[PDB]
């Protein structure tokens, strides 16, 4: 009785149902053996409760570009086997708790390029298996305590190009296994110490394009034994505090380009450092920069930049200049 829907293209004996831009106004009825349902580029302004009934074997659901504005509570009830959910490129503003009920198995959730403004408590509570939460290009302004409550195994959190200006203490307490954290291109006017101080296994921290101005003491200590990649490019960075890199023991990749740095802290970790972007900084070629000098001459392929001061060595390259001869 159940066959491929009208104007749709089915594959793998009705296991894959593709309805790409076919003028749908309602969720079509599909066979119970459906495992992949692509409803991209249709029109579903409101996803009501039980919008996907009788799809117990569905593992991948694609709903991008569907002009979706609201996801009602229990919109995805029954999808106990769903692994992928794409809600990217819609007009979602309202996203309340219950919207993600029954999504016990969901591992990848894409909500990027929407109009979400907040992440209320309990919204992600059912998502105990979520690994990637892609929320880039929204309008979230603030993360508060319990914003990620229930997200037990969240590893990658994408929040690039939002309007974040505040991370409350306790905001990330629920995401202990967090490895990737992208909050570049936001409104962070200071390093969110309190929020990050609770995480221990962060490996990549992307903070580019935030007016951070400076990095405080113990900025990375909590997760200092796991931090491998750090982006601080275009953060209007004037300097690092003396204790900023306390407990950092395996940092491999750093991006500092496009800032106002003249110096580096004495405890700057060069021991595990592999790549370091440092162009477009008014570097001061004095004694305190010898550590960077010693690192650059340890492997020739490592790019460098030019000193803005002192006057004698203005414009010379860090690796070529004679500004470090009078210190040993
Ligand atoms: Cl086919
Ligand atoms: Ni096919």
Author numbering: 20 to 347
Text taken from the publication that reported this structure:
The small leucine-rich proteoglycans (SLRPs) constitute a family of secreted proteins with important roles in extracellular matrix assembly and cell signalling. The SLRPs belong to the large superfamily of leucine-rich repeat (LRR) proteins, which includes not only secreted proteins but also a large number of cell surface receptors, such as the Toll-like receptors involved in innate immunity, the platelet von Willebrand factor receptor, glycoprotein Ib, and proteins involved in neural development. The results demonstrate that, unlike decorin, neither fibromodulin nor chondroadherin forms a stable dimer in solution.
One of the more distant homologues of fibromodulin is chondroadherin, a class IV SLRP found in cartilage and bone. We obtained crystals of human chondroadherin and determined the structure at 2.17 Å resolution. The asymmetric unit of the crystals contains two structurally similar copies of chondroadherin (r.m.s. deviation of 0.7 Å for 327 Cα atoms). Thirdly, the ear and LRR XII of fibromodulin are replaced by a C-terminal cap (LRRCT) in chondroadherin. The LRRCT is characterised by a 10-residue α-helix and two disulphide bonds (Cys304-Cys326 and Cys306-Cys346 in chondroadherin).
